[PDB]
Amino acid sequence: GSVEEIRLPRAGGPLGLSIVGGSDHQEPGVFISKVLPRGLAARSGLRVGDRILAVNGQDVRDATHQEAVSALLRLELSLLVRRD
């Protein structure tokens, strides 16, 4: 498919996205399962089904669910994602 960087401002609200998957949870990776319709992730271009590859430059391709959660919560948030 295609890889995009998506940068979100860290303005203190929710990101407005949900993830599933992880190396402990067949199709491998951490995926965006929900993007709240008017939230920051949606406005920023994130889409359901996107695979999170990297969080602020940190590789999460083979991360467990909880490892990816920790990276997301850790001034801007850079998400490298793959789609299609």
Binding site: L15, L17, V20, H25, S33, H65, V69, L73
Partner: peptide, 6 residues
């Protein structure tokens, strides 16, 4: 399995 909203 889980889904985590942030």
């Amino acid at each position: 399995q889980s889904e985590t909203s942030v």
